[PDB]
Amino acid sequence: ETQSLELAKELISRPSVTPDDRDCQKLLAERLHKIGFAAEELHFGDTKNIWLRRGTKAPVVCFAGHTDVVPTGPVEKWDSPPFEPAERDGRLYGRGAADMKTSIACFVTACERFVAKHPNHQGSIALLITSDEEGDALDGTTKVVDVLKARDELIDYCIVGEPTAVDKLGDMIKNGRRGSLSGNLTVKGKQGHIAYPHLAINPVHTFAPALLELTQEVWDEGNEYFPPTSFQISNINGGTGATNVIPGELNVKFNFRFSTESTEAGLKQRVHAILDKHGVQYDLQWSCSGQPFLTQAGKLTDVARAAIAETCGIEAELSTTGGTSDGRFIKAIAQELIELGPSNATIHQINENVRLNDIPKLSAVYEGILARLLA
Amino acid sequence: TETQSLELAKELISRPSVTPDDRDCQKLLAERLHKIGFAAEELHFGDTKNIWLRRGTKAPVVCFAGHTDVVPTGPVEKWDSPPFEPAERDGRLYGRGAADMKTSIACFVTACERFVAKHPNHQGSIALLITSDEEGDALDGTTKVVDVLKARDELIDYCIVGEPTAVDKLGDMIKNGRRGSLSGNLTVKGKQGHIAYPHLAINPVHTFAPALLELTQEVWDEGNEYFPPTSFQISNINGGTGATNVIPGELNVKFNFRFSTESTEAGLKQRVHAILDKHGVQYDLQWSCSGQPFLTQAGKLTDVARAAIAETCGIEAELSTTGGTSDGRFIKAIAQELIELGPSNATIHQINENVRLNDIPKLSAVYEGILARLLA
Ligand SMILES: [Zn+2]
């Protein structure tokens, strides 16, 4: 089949930089209407969202994704234009080729094939599609999930089509993701000429014992699904530039990518306790961009593995590593949720691409998941 | 009580000798002291004027050292009286160079005149070593004069550097030495990457952490009766460009030692490298050393200066090595014993720079007392 490729190219050619959908959701609704998918627009702010649903009864199998793509940067740095999808060297190049329009196209064609085979299949098939997953994402999937929860329209199995493969399609699926908690610390000292240290307080020096403690701390020990919670400093700056001045303050930016084994509250409490135990005097701003989520190994992960083994001939590893996805919202309404897509090697980069041969394989995988959950 | 010191101070202050311009101060000094047997040698090095004035041919040689340059005044409207129109007001003499250090130079000239008058066949020799660039780059000042004196084996037994040393009352402190300064520019190497993949990055903040702590906690030496412990301080630390989801690739750290004679440049470097290397830090380190510590232990010169201050000022002087440095760091190489002694340093390089009027004849009587205890 070449329908998946054709659809992917059609989507890629629409310059849907966040939050502009460029009529991608209209295209998808109108294509799926033929096969009984009802369309419901759920627009909020400047974001377009759509809930497409075939069927009325459980089990409900949902594909979730996003039509928006990240900015291209200057087109002249690309080998071919980012919204003029190109085949070259066994790859399809364009912004959104990996993240994540090829997945969308592959699921749509999987539904078409599946429903042609099984027009009386049990349950429901839905798509949950946003035009802002790559930006602030405050008027996107999160708001759709709230709508669905409030009306008791829950999901049994959800596949988020983000790119998850490492090197071969199907080598990796995500069954959860870390959350993210960030701190902006400003340690206070007292500026002065360096040769008169008794008139100054060096915030580098006051911070040092806490810095070491922080970087050596074991926050948790991870578990079967998650690595240990990870603390990293991104930025540190203190001084005026003069080499004969003791700084008056020191700024430190840090982040946690945390598992289910730690909480936002507990991490913050422990950081303050380490600072306070060393007598550090400080200001601290905290922000949290998302919460961890997890699906235990079970039916969904087993079905996905089986479909991958049939199509791709490889064992799919479960993982929670990397960044996050809109699964962080959807898990609240989904009994089981995974992420499954092509290689993420080129996401958000110039000359983003997917291997051509992986395109019909990914569609086949999705169709195999549908057949196992609904046929 | 003599009024000559104050009048000479005013004469000097009135000359706007912003570095390196002498404005004839050294001509004035040479001409005046020629009357009492000081021979003059001018040592012009580039843009800088220097003089070696000397009376006598034998040891002991007592030298006063100083500088006729002054720092800039800044906007002149910000002064309560014009910086080169010395003024007497509220018990103080105001003007640029009143404290740093034209009063000292005046007071030593008039001490020479009074001392020589009372002791016309004193032993030894008296000298002045004066530069027009102590405040600027000073590449052509005292250090080059010292090199000429050392090359010709014209050495000094006792030197008084007339920089202001009083903290409050004239005579409260004498400097008998200074710290040296050793600076490092440390670049800690890591490997940039997205923060969510730390195993693919190397975070230089994290690799440096244990070494940072050890460096900041280190006791480099115990001090001694003349110096505080060697002092290590981090002046700057910078890594990253503001992205909160990126592990930076390198970290810049600048630090400094103000170190005594209890530690050496090489020894401090070695210990720093050893601490970095024990913790497995990967780095580049560029060193700079702007000067070396120097010291005159308590002995004749410090004794005489304390005796003179007790007699003139009624103050029990203490010895110090604190603060920055002076041209003594150069002169000590040719002077067996060297101190710094002058009036209050409270106002140096500031607007409305001044000295107490009553301190002026006192300082000159102290200098004369030193001459008499060393040479009579
Ligand atoms: Zn995506």
Ligand SMILES: [Zn+2]
């Ligand atoms: Zn993305």
Ligand SMILES: [Zn+2]
């Ligand atoms: Zn000065």
Ligand SMILES: [Zn+2]
């Ligand atoms: Zn000076």
Ligand SMILES: [Zn+2]
């Ligand atoms: Zn006498």
